[PDB]
Amino acid sequence: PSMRPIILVGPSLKGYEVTDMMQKALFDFLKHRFDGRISITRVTADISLAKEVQSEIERIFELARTLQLVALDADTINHPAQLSKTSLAPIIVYIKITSPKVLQRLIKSRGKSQSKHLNVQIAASEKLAQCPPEMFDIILDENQLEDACEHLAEYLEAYWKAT
Amino acid sequence: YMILATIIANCIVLALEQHLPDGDKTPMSERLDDTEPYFIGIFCFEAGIKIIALGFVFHKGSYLRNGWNVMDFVVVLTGILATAGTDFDLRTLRAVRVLRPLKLVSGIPSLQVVLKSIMKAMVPLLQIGLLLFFAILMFAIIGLEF
């Protein structure tokens, strides 16, 4: 695409309340911060199969044609390696939970349905942590919403200046 | 836990005693002195259990090889000796009955840990004790002179 689409890898597998809400908070900060400069869309199709799936690829290029910032809410993308072999060349921003047990307490905090599944979430966090820093275009190991939002917004301002 | 219960009951019985000037006695004092053999029997019972289950000195781990169990043995032995029918036993063998609150420490290991934490910082204070006694002695000699 003209500019790399914004896909965020969450601390744990997507579709779970912890990652869902944290990623959604970042999404909504972006939609307020870059209003008139950014585009946020849902991507339900499995774009890790890229090389219905092909139709969403051309759509991703289409929203990126007009030099508007494009944000993909890809539900199936839970690891940067899923987008290494695609032609999308996305921007990878990693919401990093620096220590595991705070993430454990986070998950146990979300009601009692989220508490049912945990091992998948820790293994997701560890698997995403094993990844090299270079793969993650922007790292978010912060704990404050203002800090992480300002970091990502500053990086996107620099990237827009690049475009 | 029942030993700790009897120790606490014994502390309450000791705190319930009241002394009167010239041989007078509160009516409750007779009851609090008739409740003594129960505590003596229970303490001697645990002493017997810990002496037959463990050794005495020979195993190098035993009753009399633990400093805290030596205090328990002294307390129970003097309690036994407090009914010997002699004339001079009352003034002293009933004055070692005051160490039974310390059986709480002797039974609760965390209290022993905290007590060691207290008393290990007071070992370097013995040199201050020697200095204090030397100063006290020198000033006492000067006061004798003057």
Next chain:
Amino acid sequence: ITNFDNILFAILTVFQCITMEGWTDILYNTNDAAGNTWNWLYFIPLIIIGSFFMLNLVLGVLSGEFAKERERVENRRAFLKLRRQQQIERELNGYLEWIFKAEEVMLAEEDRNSYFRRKEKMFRFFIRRMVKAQSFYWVVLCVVALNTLCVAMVHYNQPRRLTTTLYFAEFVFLGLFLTEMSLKMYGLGPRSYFRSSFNCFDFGVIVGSVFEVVWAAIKPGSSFGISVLRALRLLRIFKVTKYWSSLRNLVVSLLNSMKSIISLLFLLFLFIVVFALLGMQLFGGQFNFQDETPTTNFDTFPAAILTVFQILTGEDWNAVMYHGIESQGGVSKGMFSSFYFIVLTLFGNYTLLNVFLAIAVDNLANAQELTKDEEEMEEAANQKLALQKAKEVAARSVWEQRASQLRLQNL
């Protein structure tokens, strides 16, 4: 008893001067017996070299021992765990802030399109921003300071208009604080309200205030003095200063080691009990020779324990020693009962200092390394964050220095 007629009597009087208890009674006695021109040379050097220089020596040795204990492998491990959990608590607070903002915006976008539950949750979330704003905090502080002002004008013979005014003001302030507690419950939940140590204390003080109001309704005279504890909420003023970190960490260390502070104050109680029982054994029912029994007698157990406590505080321990010497005979033959008080004021004025200085040094230091480590990790994280974000766009006290050196040596 206070004479230099012998080396034992001289040692007893000198030791009683060392404890600075009635050391001027003896000085005045030697000012009447002899001239007063030279007697200060015996006693003021005595006080300086026995009670001020030796107390300095004791404090120095104890502080050195506490410093050496602090930088030891097991205590170092315990402090490392404490700092780890404080770090994780801060991280969890930040992440829960992320999730709360997200849940708020999700609720907003769901409502812009179960209605009763949605409205209830939206009202709860509005309260939750309300109970965390920097305006509710100042309103609560102003209410507390008005409640502190009311209890501070309660004097004797206050105007009969003031008594009823403060009665109705107590009821009004209780209503306001129940309102605040309920609002914080609703916005935060019992699971998260009691996470804060101050909130648990306030809840306890609200319960105590309600209990005291009910009790005063039952008995219109009694006053437990528990509603005054709402003045400790004025400590929240430190939240808007730079002193918040050190005091919060001091309270955190106190709470963490409270299982070792309760156990410490129980050994003091056990030793006070042992000395009270021994005092009843030795001087029980024998302080009646003066033709009246003193207030500090050893007859009953409350009286014995109060006498032992007063000797521990070191006030008029020499007077109790004189009375206990005369109770057992006199200066002629009862002077070997002065070892009870000597032992109780040596092993009671130095174990009190040992225990309470251990508590104070340990917890104050733990606070110091906690706040210093959190400041240093804040700045280190900021600088690492700078040098990583810019990557992708293209003195100390002698105690702290010695503690670092001790940590190096023990490593």
Next chain:
Amino acid sequence: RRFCHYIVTMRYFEVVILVVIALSSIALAAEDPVRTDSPRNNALKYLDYIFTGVFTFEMVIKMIDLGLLLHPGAYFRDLWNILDFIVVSGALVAFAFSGSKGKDINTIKSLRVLRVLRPLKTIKRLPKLKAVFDCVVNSLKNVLNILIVYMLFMFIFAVIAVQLFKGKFFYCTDESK
């Protein structure tokens, strides 16, 4: 004349002022409180007149050199200068009111007590004593955040003590009424 006032402040004036302060402190130690009409008190009153004159002279020297309060780095910019004003002005005001008229009594004793700040000049005139004072003040600032907590806790305890014992500490001379 300001160069003259400057050189007067540097012609070994500090040691002379220190000697004056020390001698005046000794004079304060020598006064007799119980016998206000003693001849020794009269001699020390004349000595205090001399010392007040010396301090007023130093005071006006510093007036001319530093300037009262206008610019930075001048007089009244250091609290020691205000303390010097307090000492000198109190002595002069007491001297003016010491007309031996008998109209007022309680004021003259307070203005004489105002002299005791005289030794506190040396704490600035000696740099090492000033360093020790600054260390003490730094300690007081270090424990100031715990002094406020201490005073608050003692305030709750004092209010509880009032509520417990307000109006109850009364007694008769006889223990039966």
Next chain:
Amino acid sequence: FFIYAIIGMQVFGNIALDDDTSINRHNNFRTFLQALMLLFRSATGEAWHEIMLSCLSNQACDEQANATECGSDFAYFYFVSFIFLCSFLMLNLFVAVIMDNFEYLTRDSSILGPHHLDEFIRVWANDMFEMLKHMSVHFTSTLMALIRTALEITKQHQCDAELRKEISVVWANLPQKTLDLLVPPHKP
């Protein structure tokens, strides 16, 4: 002590010496030495509150004192302020003397220090073997070498460079060869 003694003399000097009060013939403010003794008595906390009450307003004045009304309610501030000022200054003195020796109060037996150097001086009475059997360019060089063994700051040349840097840092007060003498002794 001096300032408070003078204040006590001026304000509280003419109170009448009654033996049933706490302003005795032993404990008066009537002279500098007596006022200073009273201050030292209150510094040690010896019934200072009774003195304060004996110094309050409306006390009997002395027979040879011109003023009929003697004593003032300033005694509250006087005695309270003296008590905590003296306590604070004395505690500051205590802490200053404590931290002036904190490397000795926290001293650990294993790590070598001034005691080691005093022991080596006593060694003067070969003997190095016996001393090391009793232990935790003639003698000063051996002192420097044994201090090197005590704590580590080829590796020998790097330590020599460290010692030369230290010598440059702490070059003595116009010494011809004193630190350079140590360097010639630090060569081995």
Next chain:
Amino acid sequence: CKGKGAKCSRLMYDCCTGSCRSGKC
């Protein structure tokens, strides 16, 4: 409560307006 100058005992503390010093209030 013993008046001023009354014979008292130190440990009694019944020495209203003062303290028992040298056996006298």
Next chain:
Amino acid sequence: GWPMVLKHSVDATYEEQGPSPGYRMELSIFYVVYFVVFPFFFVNIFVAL
């Protein structure tokens, strides 16, 4: 002079009433709790700090 204040505190009966010796010995805990806090703990906080 803290034990004399303790004696006056316990003996205190009611507002505008004279003392009754021995009355209200439960109010010895106010002074025990006060000593545990200020003379013992807070003063040691100052010393340690």
